[PDB]
């Protein structure tokens, strides 16, 4: 009842003896291989901790150390990034001419002619243009010299060492206890106020002391070497007052509540700074301060050891109505017992958050000169979209895993979940009908438009010029956003984003940064396509989750496990009934959704936003506003998008972009390679390996580890893995080549 620190000493000895024993964690795998299937199982069950043991404490300690190892690897990755920015980059040249220099941080060795990939990136540098956007981040933070990036890389290496050591420590030495992990109130309190609150406050402290002044000097055109060091703004406050006058007071308005003085460097002007194209740094610092205060407050909701505060158990149990019975009672016991339930929730939320990040970073460019680096923006958007989609599919997978393994109404019951299970049929049937209706009333419109345009009837299509389907709701919403500053937002000087407010076109260095985005029949059709694809993905995954235990076809499916091939050719055929195969198909459908999403983004930005601006204000977009007429047709998507914009990747040979031309075809290859696995079954392959084994045994060269074709589940896993890799890498090469050439 009293939250406190609880660990055990030396639970597991540090020795290499278990290193030399493959499959030590599993009791069936530890005997060594009789056939080759063993080799695969060792990797498939490598991280399935709750199948290695049933003790929740061992599982929690393993998970803790795995988190520490992941943090070590992420810190090592960041160390590499900052070190490459310091040692093999042209960041100092990009800092003087950000509008002409191409950001590059990788230089290849000259061995087999690959030095052609070291292309002219400007600033007297031959390298590979980077789209990660680290240059924009390092500029926004105020970094100028390579020495600061060196020191950041060294600090990241030290932190990777710290994380690795802590991972060893909290498993082999002082390893925490189960109740320690289960102190959810204390943990949420420290993550809201200690982690997020103090983190936002620390970053706001950096931004008001380094980012704002150094970036003022960078905007003014001062040479970065002639710019004062950041710590010189912490000693002589005259330097800070000459840029932001309120720093001459000295925390006095903060304590006396004269905060109106701080409006010089803590503003609410919104929009974009027209010199850099990013959000006003004063606004971002003010934002981080507000976020810090909000999270520092929110980290006090949950009781711990001093009576005051909430207990999540009471809050859950108190929320029950006439439709859901005694709902929420029992959820606190579920979410404090099952790791997979927490993982499902957090994967869903983190993936949706990544998607929200992808939208918010394009519509509100946070870093200077990011909005005009079209390659960096496109790459960031697409990457975050893929991350979010994958994480949501994983949420589905782990929800199904919890259903199969941690669900038991006789011990940890919940009324809401039981009620959901008692009408899974209605839920799935209704989602099925919604998916059919959306498939007809989105893609069927595209087929209608294709058939009308082919028959010489352009007025019988669904177009901005013919049968119009205007997204009136979204148009009215963005209009209400445009008129909000000065009315329903008096403190706001301009619009929340530039895509709202009419007019106010921001351009940087001859290229546009942002302008009001049109919304027409094409946008309507594409948004309905997105809704439909999301719905079908949700249908697949949720239907897999709800029917994980039982169904009219197999009433004992839970006994077969979470990951099993089938249950025989009987009942007409029972292939792909496990929840694992539902995740397997949801992978394909998440791909099919996210691909259309990112293609929509690419064509929209290249047609109605991105382009070149004249001296007199004439903006010509990368494609001549062809989105309204061409994207309302499948043939238009085939011709005016793929066939036209793949030119750069099919012409990149003999230039620094030829690596993208190679990856294009290689990803085509692996994508088609997956089709061998997805279209076939392991019986034929085993019968082939039989004759091959005959051939080997004829020459006294057959292995003891008897070769065996991949398992059915492994066949599907390899198939979907290669399919996803091929498709995503093809789109990656295509996007990068196109946007780096025409950007």
């Amino acid at each position: 009842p009293e939250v406190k620190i609880l660990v055990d000493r030396d639970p597991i000895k540090t020795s290499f003896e278990q290193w030399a024993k493959p499959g030590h964690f599993s009791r069936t795998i530890a005997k060594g291989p009789d056939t080759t299937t063993w080799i695969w199982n060792l990797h498939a069950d490598a991280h399935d901790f709750d199948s290695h043991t049933s003790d929740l404490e061992e599982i929690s300690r393993k998970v803790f150390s795995a988190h520490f190892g992941q943090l070590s690897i992420i810190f090592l990755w960041l160390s590499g990034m900052y070190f490459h920015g310091a040692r093999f980059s042209n960041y100092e040249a990009w800092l003087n001419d950000p509008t002409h220099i191409r950001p590059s941080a990788q230089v290849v060795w000259p061995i087999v002619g690959q030095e052609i990939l070291n292309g002219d990136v400007g600033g007297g540098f031959r390298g590979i243009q980077i789209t990660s956007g680290f240059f924009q981040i390092w500029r926004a933070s105020g970094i100028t010299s390579e020495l600061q990036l060196y020191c950041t890389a060294i600090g990241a290496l030290v932190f990777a060492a710290l994380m690795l050591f802590a991972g060893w420590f909290h498993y082999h030495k002082a390893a925490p206890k189960l109740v320690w992990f289960q102190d959810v109130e204390s943990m949420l309190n420290h993550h809201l106020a200690g982690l997020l609150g103090l983190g936002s406050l620390s970053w706001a402290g950096h931004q008001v002391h380094v980012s704002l002044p150094i970036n003022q000097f960078l905007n003014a055109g001062v040479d970065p070497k002639e710019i004062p060091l950041p710590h010189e703004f912490i000693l002589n406050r005259d330097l800070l007052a000459q840029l932001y006058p309120s720093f001459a007071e000295g925390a006095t308005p903060f304590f006396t509540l004269n905060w109106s003085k701080y409006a010089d460097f803590l503003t609410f002007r919104g929009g974009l700074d027209p010199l850099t194209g990013g959000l006003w740094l004063t606004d971002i610092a003010h934002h981080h301060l507000a976020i810090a205060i909000l999270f520092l407050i929110a980290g006090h909701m949950y009781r711990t050891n001093w009576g005051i505060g909430h207990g999540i158990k009471d809050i859950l149990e108190a929320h029950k109505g006439p439709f859901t019975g005694q709902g929420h009672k029992g959820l606190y016991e579920i979410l404090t017992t099952s790791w997979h339930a927490q993982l499902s929730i957090n994967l869903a939320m983190l993936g949706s958050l990544t998607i929200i990040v992808a939208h918010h970073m394009y519509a509100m460019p946070p870093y200077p000169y990011l909005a005009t680096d079209y390659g960096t923006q496109l790459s960031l958007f697409t990457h975050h979209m893929w991350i979010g989609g994958f994480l949501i599919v994983g949420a589905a997978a782990h929800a199904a895993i919890f259903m199969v393994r941690d669900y038991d109404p006789t011990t940890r019951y919940n009324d809401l979940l039981d009620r959901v299970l008692r009408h899974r049929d209605a839920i799935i049937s209704h989602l099925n009908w919604v998916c059919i209706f959306l498939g007809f009333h989105s893609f069927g419109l595209y087929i209608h438009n294709d058939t009308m345009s082919a028959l010489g009837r352009p007025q019988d299509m669904f177009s901005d010029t013919a049968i119009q389907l205007q997204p009136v709701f979204a148009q009215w919403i963005q209009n209400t956003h445009a008129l909000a500053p000065g009315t329903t937002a008096p403190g706001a000087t301009t619009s929340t984003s530039l895509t709202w407010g009419g007019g106010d076109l921001v351009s940087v260095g001859g290229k546009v940064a942002l302008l009001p985005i049109p919304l027409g029949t094409a946008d309507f059709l594409v948004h309905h396509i997105h809704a439909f694809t999301i719905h079908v993905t949700v249908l697949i995954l949720l239907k897999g989750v709800l029917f994980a235990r039982s169904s009219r076809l197999i009433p004992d499916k839970a006994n077969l496990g979470f990951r099993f091939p089938c249950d025989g050719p009987g009942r007409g055929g029972t292939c792909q009934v496990s929840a694992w195969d539902h995740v397997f198909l949801g992978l394909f459908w998440m791909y099919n959704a996210i691909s259309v999403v990112i293609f929509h983004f690419s064509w929209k930005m290249q047609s109605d936003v991105w382009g070149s601006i004249n001296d007199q204000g004439v903006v010509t977009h990368i494609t001549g506003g062809n989105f309204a007429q061409s994207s309302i047709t499948i043939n238009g998507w085939l011709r005016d998008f793929l066939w036209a914009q793949a030119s750069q990747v099919i012409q990149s040979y003999g230039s620094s972009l030829s690596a993208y031309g190679l990856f294009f075809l290689g990803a085509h290859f692996v994508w088609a390679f997956s089709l061998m696995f997805l279209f076939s079954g392991r019986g034929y392959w085993q019968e082939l390996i039989e004759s091959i084994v005959w051939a080997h045994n004829k020459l006294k060269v057959a292995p003891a580890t008897q070769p065996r074709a991949l398992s059915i589940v492994q066949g599907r896993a390899v198939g979907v893995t290669h399919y996803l890799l091929g498709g995503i890498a093809t789109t990656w090469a295509f996007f990068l080549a196109r946007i780096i050439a025409v950007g």
């Binding site: 009219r552 076809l553 197999i554 004992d556 249950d567 025989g568 050719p569 009987g570 009942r571 007409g572 029972t574």
Partner: protein
């Protein structure tokens, strides 16, 4: 309905009867093997064809054989 047959290679381990999810297999007394028992399929009208019995037979080759035949409501696993 699906046809199920038991061959005299059966050793009488009663594993096909334990794995059967619709109670099609039985263990009858016999004199051929050591356990004094062999399998029989007297209720193939309820057989669904899952071949869960064949997955559990230790005989090489199998002693239970499920030959998928004419589909019925019972063999298709329909609750409707």
């Amino acid at each position: 309905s699906h046809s199920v047959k038991i061959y005299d290679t059966c050793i009488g381990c009663t594993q096909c009867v334990r794995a059967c999810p619709t109670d099609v297999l039985e263990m009858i007394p016999w004199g051929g093997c050591k356990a004094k028992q062999i399998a029989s399929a007297p209720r193939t009208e309820d057989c669904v064809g899952c071949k869960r019995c064949e997955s559990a037979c230790p005989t090489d080759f199998l002693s239970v054989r499920v030959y998928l035949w004419h589909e019925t409501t019972r063999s298709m696993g329909l609750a409707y």
